[PDB]
């Protein structure tokens, strides 16, 4: 990608979404979401939020490319859970890249 790095795989985390249905849906579907994130070096962003917003958009978009090719879709529920998953990973990624400065 255009100046994009790829972080290492992270463990899939148990995330609670607050309702019995969403909790079950996520547990049944979490393996279909990213377990690594695309990002740019920290100096390419004015602040953490900018870094994190971009990392999430790129990561989801590119993951929404590989599963489309595989024949599958993402529901609205999927995209919302995925964006919450990816945002946690993107922050973790920033933390690494950050505390080294």
- H, E, C per residue of 10-31: CCCCCCCCCCHHHHHHHHHHHH
Tokens encoding 29: 């579907």
- Total structural domains within the chain: 1
The conformation of residue 70, written as its DSSP 8-state character, comes to T
And the tokens for 53? 């917003």
Q: For residue 3, which phi and psi values (nearest 5 degrees)?
A: 75, 10
What resolution does the deposited structure have, in angstroms? 2.2
Q: 54: which 2 tokens? A: 């971009």
82 phi, psi to nearest 5 deg = -60, -45
Query: Distance between CA 72 and CA 64 in Å, rounded?
Result: 9
Domain of 10 in residue numbering reads as 1-101
């Amino acid at each position: 990608l255009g100046g994009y790095m790829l972080g290492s795989a992270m463990s899939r985390p148990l995330i609670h979404f607050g309702s019995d249905y969403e909790d079950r849906y996520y547990r049944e579907n979490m393996h279909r979401y990213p377990n690594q994130v695309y990002y740019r070096p920290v100096d390419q962003y004015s602040n953490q939020n900018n870094f994190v917003h971009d990392c999430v958009n790129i990561t989801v978009k590119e993951h929404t490319v590989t599963t489309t090719t595989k024949g599958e879709n993402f529901t609205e529920t999927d995209i919302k859970m995925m964006e919450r998953v990816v945002e946690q990973m993107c922050i973790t990624q920033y933390q690494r890249e950050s505390q080294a400065y």
